[PDB]
């Protein structure tokens, strides 16, 4: 009904039991993600570079090989930058494009532009090659479950899944209102002015975004994710509960509840990131960015060598469980 944009306010998860939690933990592979999804992305890939094209092709190819009915769209646009007009390309991967509601996971796939120093190149391992690879691994690990979302004569889902890989999150020169968030600013405005579902008189694609889960700066040891917003606080609590359950079942590695990732801790300030253009239009956001930022932030040391594989593996399991429970799969 025309209250369908309010359904997100009443939506509850379908909780997984212990057996299912073990199955999900066993179904993801950090080493396969590392070799097949993460390492091809550990390249210079600022917007418009050859590496940006190679990264986009890799992301699309890894989604395209899956059995689930992903619809891939490239959102290419022109923007002014400190280096003049440039082209950018957001990547969107949607299951059930005409379903009214989607849970949305997102990160940025560009890497910040820097000069090279003594044969060193910035590859943004935490920022955000690892979030990209986590999203690809979730699509792979959950592929057989997500296949059941596919629209047939028997069933068409109200609620499905979408992935967004933003281009141009980073400033080209100096972080500023004109030099930042190129892809997310563009895509939020575009979705805000696109009727959804097709044929709708008065609702946009933005109204169908149940929840935007934004991964950024993930892969360093001991991350702490604050609970940022009152309208996603209850979903933050579900992340806490999932971390705690997986912990008690012995399904996490190198993990203590004293140093857990999702603490009883909120953050009143603003973190400027790709969620802001969505947040400012009323989309609920779960912002999975650590506070403080990793010490390697925007340095040449944000590389593969300094990633913490167990932390990523643990967060893969938590995120996959969260997504299945949200979608009732
Ligand atoms: Zn566009
Ligand atoms: Zn370069
Ligand atoms: Zn960054
Ligand atoms: Zn306990
Ligand atoms: Zn261990």
Swiss-Prot record:
It comes from Homo sapiens (Human). The active site is at residues 169, 216. Keywords: Acyltransferase, Disulfide bond, Glycoprotein, Metal-binding, Secreted, Signal, Transferase, Zinc. It comes from the Eukaryota. It catalyses: N-terminal L-glutaminyl-[peptide] = N-terminal 5-oxo-L-prolyl-[peptide] + NH4(+). CDD domains: M28_QC_like (cd03880). GO terms for molecular function: glutaminyl-peptide cyclotransferase activity; zinc ion binding. Pfam families: Peptidase_M28 (PF04389). Glycans are attached at residues 17, 264. Changing residue 216 to A: Reduces activity by 99%. Belongs to the glutaminyl-peptide cyclotransferase family. It is an enzyme of class 2 (transferase). GO terms for biological process: peptidyl-pyroglutamic acid biosynthetic process, using glutaminyl-peptide cyclotransferase; protein modification process. Zn(2+) binds at residues 127, 170, 298. This is Glutaminyl-peptide cyclotransferase. Disulfide bonds join 107-132. It is found in: Secreted. Responsible for the biosynthesis of pyroglutamyl peptides. Has a bias against acidic and tryptophan residues adjacent to the N-terminal glutaminyl residue and a lack of importance of chain length after the second residue. Also catalyzes N-terminal pyroglutamate formation. May be involved in the N-terminal pyroglutamate formation of several amyloid-related plaque-forming peptides. One of its GO terms (cellular component) is extracellular region. Its EC number is 2.3.2.5. Changing residue 128 to G: Reduces activity by 96%. InterPro entries: M28_QC, Peptidase_M28, QC/QCL.
